[PDB]
Write a protein that binds this DNA or RNA. Structure first.
Ligand SMILES: Nc1ccn([C@H]2CC[C@@H](COP(=O)(O)OP(=O)(O)OP(=O)(O)O)O2)c(=O)n1
Ligand SMILES: OC[C@H]1O[C@@](CO)(O[C@H]2O[C@H](CO)[C@@H](O)[C@H](O)[C@H]2O)[C@@H](O)[C@@H]1O
Ligand SMILES: OC[C@H]1O[C@@](CO)(O[C@H]2O[C@H](CO)[C@@H](O)[C@H](O)[C@H]2O)[C@@H](O)[C@@H]1O
Ligand SMILES: [Mn+2]
Length: 580
DNA sequence: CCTGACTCG
DNA sequence: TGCGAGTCAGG
């Protein structure tokens, strides 16, 4: 605990070195158009601190940040780049991101600051962000001397830990995953974040108005059937109405009381018609509060755009998450909700929304990884397994399978491949638990390869302590040999799923890098807007639609090569809704 | 702040 | 007693 640094007045030559650690401190958790409160640099020549109004105005510093031959090591470089694009400054030459490096080494650590990453290497010369800035309503940037030291210490740490982290990544054969997949992707996400998505507020406000009219309607109806007023959005009061006043049977409890989950409500339908009305009310209430009122609170009024943050170092399987707003969970399943998408539009004049989508991506990953004959064959002829399961459950034929019921048989295929027990399956389809068992038992005799993959990956996880995905992403399962049935089972199901979801996650990540490449090389104006786990979303001038119909799917299928082919569905239209 | 509800993959 | 997420209302 003793460090020398220079609290600089101006940018000097010795700070513009070819290799350095860089800290562009942004305290606000949502970094979009957020204050940059301090800058630090560590290189061969020394340790420096700079005030932002100094460094960001000095054209030489800006030129050094923008030069990709001047290599930077950073912690969460997406935060920096974005907070810099809002200051009209471009960041280039990031060769090491400690955050991503740490997330690949172990997603469970849930690293959020340099101190926690340093924790993994015994490096103790840096304080965590909360012990410096404060918590919640106390969150305060301290006095400069304190601020400076801390930032310099963060650089110093990034500076000392680069090699160790890279050294460990090389042993696990995860170095190329960092440098060639994750890190390049970080910059792409920073663009999509900054470009934003344009929203039709006029339309959005009109719908919430209509939604309110329907909410009051359904609501009155609910009080009439119940013969009283209560708070529908209060599960405790609703529970009293349904199970105490109305006497409806209790199908399930939780640790705090009676259950009123959608699943329980659908099963209570024969007994009383208020349950269906509650379901419908809850549906509309969510649309209003989250997808109208939530969404309008985060639009930037001047440009009518929303800017989400794609949290890259958070999920345990390798997926991304989307926050403030979440644009990866916009309604589509029920026609009423699906309408919200009409308000998502192109940002320019004659531009359109292109939406490409992988077909059964996790079922193909399972096929490739488990090497199952009957499964690999079905895909080679181009059978639709969801449609092959739609019939099998809905007694129907291929000729009449509505999109609605290809989604309900979709969750059965996936459910089965991810350790759903017969209790789960029967409780999802309202069928006999004996019949549920039969389905599964048949499935594993029909696909013996998939069954043995399940047995094997659990065995391997017990022996190794972890599982891995195609591009060597890793998840550790320390609870895998727990004596407790519940604890053991949960980790076992993670040993089944992770390699699959994680692999689909790797693939679509790679597909984005190649797409971005194939875009800038062909000099097109088209650019990525969103990723929703297994689908990409772009906007482009009307003219470019021809190339994209050929380009986008070609890139997504050619990303990786598997023991089965990869298929992509695509559509375009003037609204994200019409892109169906 | 947590629990349970809804939303997506 | 299928997996991975986020946000919101009530208590
Ligand atoms: N009920 C569901 C739906 C989705 N998923 C996970 C596993 C698959 C991954 C992608 O699913 P979708 O994009 O919904 O469908 P797909 O099978 O990948 O492709 P398609 O749209 O052609 O059915 O998300 C899941 O576990 N359970
Ligand atoms: O930018 C995402 C990146 O930031 C970190 C901390 O450096 O997470 C913080 O910001 C997130 C996005 O706003 C919040 O969800 C989270 O609460 C906060 O810790 C990284 O963990 C994350 O990858
Ligand atoms: O360095 C990580 C990198 O290794 C890759 C690419 O070479 O996988 C290769 O090495 C693996 C074992 O050494 C094999 O599974 C594979 O056959 C081989 O291509 C990437 O998957 C990984 O990111
Ligand atoms: Mn898909």
């Amino acid at each position: 605990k003793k460090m020398a640094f220079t609290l600089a007045d101006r940018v000097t030559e010795e700070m513009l070195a070819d290799k350095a650690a860089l800290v562009v401190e942004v305290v606000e958790e949502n970094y979009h158009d957020a204050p940059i409160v301090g800058i630090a640099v560590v290189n061969e020549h020394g340790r420096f601190f700079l005030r932002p109004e100094t460094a960001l105005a000095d054209p030489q510093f800006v030129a050094w940040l923008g030069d990709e031959t001047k290599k930077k090591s950073m912690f969460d470089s997406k935060r920096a780049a974005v907070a810099l694009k809002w200051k009209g400054i471009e960041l280039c030459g990031v060769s090491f991101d400690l955050l991503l490096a740490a997330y690949l080494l172990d997603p469970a650590q849930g690293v959020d600051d340099v101190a926690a990453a340093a924790k993994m290497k015994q490096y103790e010369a840096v304080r965590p962000d909360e012990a410096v800035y404060g918590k919640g309503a106390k969150r305060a940037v301290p006095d400069e001397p304190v601020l400076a030291e801390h930032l310099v210490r963060k650089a110093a740490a990034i500076w000392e830990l680069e090699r160790p982290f890279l050294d460990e990544l090389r042993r696990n054969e995860q170095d190329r995953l960092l440098v060639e997949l994750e890190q390049p992707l970080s910059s792409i996400l920073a663009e999509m974040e900054f470009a934003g998505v344009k929203v039709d507020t006029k339309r959005l406000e009109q719908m919430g108005k209509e939604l309110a009219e329907q909410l009051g309607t359904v609501e009155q109806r609910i009080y009439e059937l119940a013969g009283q007023e209560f708070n529908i959005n209060s599960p405790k009061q609703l529970g009293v109405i349904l199970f105490e006043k109305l006497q409806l049977p209790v199908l399930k409890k939780t640790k705090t009381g009676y259950s009123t989950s959608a699943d329980v409500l659908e099963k209570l339908a024969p007994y009383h018609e208020i349950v269906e009305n509650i379901l419908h009310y809850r549906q509309l209430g969510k649309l209003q509060s989250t997808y109208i009122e939530g969404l309008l609170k985060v639009v930037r009024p001047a440009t009518k755009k929303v800017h989400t943050i794609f949290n890259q170092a958070l999920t345990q399987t390798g997926r991304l998450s989307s926050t403030e707003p979440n644009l990866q969970n916009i309604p589509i399943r029920l026609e009423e909700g699906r309408k919200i998408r009409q308000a998502f539009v192109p940002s320019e004049s004659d531009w359109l929304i292109f939406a490409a989508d992988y077909s059964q991506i996790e079922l193909r990953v399972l096929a490739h990884i488990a090497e199952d004959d009957n499964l690999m064959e079905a895909f080679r002829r181009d059978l639709d397994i969801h449609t092959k399961t739609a019939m099998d459950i809905f007694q129907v034929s291929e000729d009449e399978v509505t999109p609605n019921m290809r989604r309900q048989a979709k969750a059965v295929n996936y459910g089965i491949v991810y350790g759903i027990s017969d209790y789960g399956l029967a409780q999802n389809l309202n069928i006999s638990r004996k019949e549920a068992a039969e389905f599964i038992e048949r499935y594993f005799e029909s696909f013996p390869g998939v069954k043995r993959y399940m047995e094997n990956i659990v065995q391997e996880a017990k022996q190794k302590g972890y599982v891995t995905t195609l591009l060597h992403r890793r998840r550790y399962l320390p609870d895998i040999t727990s004596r407790n049935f519940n604890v053991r089972s949960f980790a076992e199901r993670m040993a089944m799923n992770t390699p699959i979801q994680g692999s689909a996650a790797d693939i679509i990540k790679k597909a984005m890098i190649d797409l971005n490449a194939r875009l800038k090389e062909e000099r097109l104006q088209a650019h990525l807007l969103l990723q929703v786990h297994d689908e990409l979303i772009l906007e482009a001038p009307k003219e470019e639609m021809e190339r994209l119909c050929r380009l986008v799917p070609e890139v997504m299928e050619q990303a990786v090569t598997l023991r089965v082919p990869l298929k992509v569905d695509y559509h375009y239209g003037s609204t994200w809704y019409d892109a169906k």
